[PDB]
């Protein structure tokens, strides 16, 4: 795998600053404006949920209402339960989805079948 | 409601000093503008005046978005007894002729 | 002279009432006393638990606080001004404060002239 000509192994060690320009204009602006308490609180929960997990079996689910959180190299491999308004949708954060939001991977409405 | 004695006596002594009270009908307003430095939320003023009205010591009127309150003779009596002042002192509404 | 020794208590307490100079109970009295911002303490004999009287007397003796001694609980509470009275003005509902402490006095010559002289 590679993202914008940068392999994941040096995305991890890469710091908060020079990660900004690699992302698209929207995310770049979001990171420029800086993250609030609940975003950091989620990251802390996710890195802890990963740290306490076994080295073979996948990290235990972390539930959240934060649909508007940007996926970071830190969050790759994590099991996130994203709130859709009604229930929680479980998602394994893959390396390829490092630009988008959580909200995109938990669909709010049921797909329409006509009758 | 549950509010500290300082706020209660501050509202009562203002009411006794002037003889009237005005609130803006908003529970979220940070501090009453007349009671600045004392740190008295508008909520406390409204509910204090409501509590004193319910017994029948103060006459309320409501214009557009503002509460208005007039202290009566029973209120004057109640306040003089509660605040502990000598009968010599009278409100600004009862000073002139 | 003419006035009774215990009569000063009521005058002092009822005159110190307006200034809010009367630390009531023990978990307010002790913490006020521990700053040394208190003058006098009043304790009742009707104290079933032992440790109460020895604690308050020891703490009051510690920083040289003078003591007035009252007989029962309900009377002290009535003198300080806790009790609720009826339309005629008789004590209906009474609550006992076994230990009371004072920080600030009022201005009463008839009260001041005797109460301190009880400690001479």
């Amino acid at each position: 795998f590679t993202y914008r000509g940068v392999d994941l192994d040096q995305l991890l060690d890469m710091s908060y600053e020079q990660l900004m320009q690699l992302y698209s204009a929207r995310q770049r602006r979001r990171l420029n404006r800086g993250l609030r308490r609940k975003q950091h609180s989620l990251l802390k929960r996710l890195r802890k949920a990963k740290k306490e997990a076994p080295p073979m079996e996948k990290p235990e689910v972390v539930k959240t209402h934060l649909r508007d959180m940007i996926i970071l190299p830190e969050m790759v491999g994590s099991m996130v339960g994203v709130y859709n308004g009604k229930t929680f949708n479980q998602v394994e954060i893959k390396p390829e989805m490092i630009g988008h939001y959580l909200g995109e991977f938990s669909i709010t409405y049921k797909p329409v079948k006509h009758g | 409601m549950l509010m500290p004695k300082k706020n209660r006596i501050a509202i009562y002594e203002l009411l006794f000093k002037e003889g009237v009270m005005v609130a803006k009908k908003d529970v979220h307003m940070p501090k009453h503008p007349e009671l600045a430095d004392k740190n008295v939320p508008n909520l406390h003023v409204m509910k204090a005046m409501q509590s004193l009205k319910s017994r029948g010591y103060v006459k309320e009127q409501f214009a557009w978005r503002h509460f208005y309150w007039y202290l009566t003779n029973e209120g004057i009596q109640y306040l003089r007894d509660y605040l502990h002042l000598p009968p010599e002192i009278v409100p600004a509404t009862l000073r002139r002729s | 002279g003419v006035m009774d020794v215990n009569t000063a208590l009521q005058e002092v307490l009822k005159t110190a009432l307006i200034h809010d100079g009367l630390a009531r109970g023990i978990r307010e009295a002790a913490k006020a006393l521990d700053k040394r911002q208190a003058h006098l303490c009043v304790l009742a004999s009707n104290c079933d638990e032992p440790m109460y009287v020895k604690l308050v007397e020891a703490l009051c003796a510690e920083h040289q606080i003078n003591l007035i001694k009252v007989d029962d609980n309900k009377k002290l509470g009535e003198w300080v001004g806790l009790c609720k009275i009826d339309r005629e003005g008789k004590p209906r509902k009474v609550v006992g404060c076994s230990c009371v402490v004072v920080k600030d006095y009022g201005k009463e010559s008839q009260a001041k002239d005797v109460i301190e002289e009880y400690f001479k």
Partner: protein, 65 residues
Amino acid sequence: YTTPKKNKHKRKKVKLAVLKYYKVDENGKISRLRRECPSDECGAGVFMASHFDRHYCGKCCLTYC
């Protein structure tokens, strides 16, 4: 409802709590069993708590290990 019922927290009623603060000997050694809160306003007026593995002040929210 799916939940049985959500009950409000009731404060555990303790009798004469300030007697645990002092330990007065017969000849009169008034030793404070709980530690004093070292903050400005609390000083000499507030006796900071002693939990199983930490200290805590209810007024200023000061904590020590």
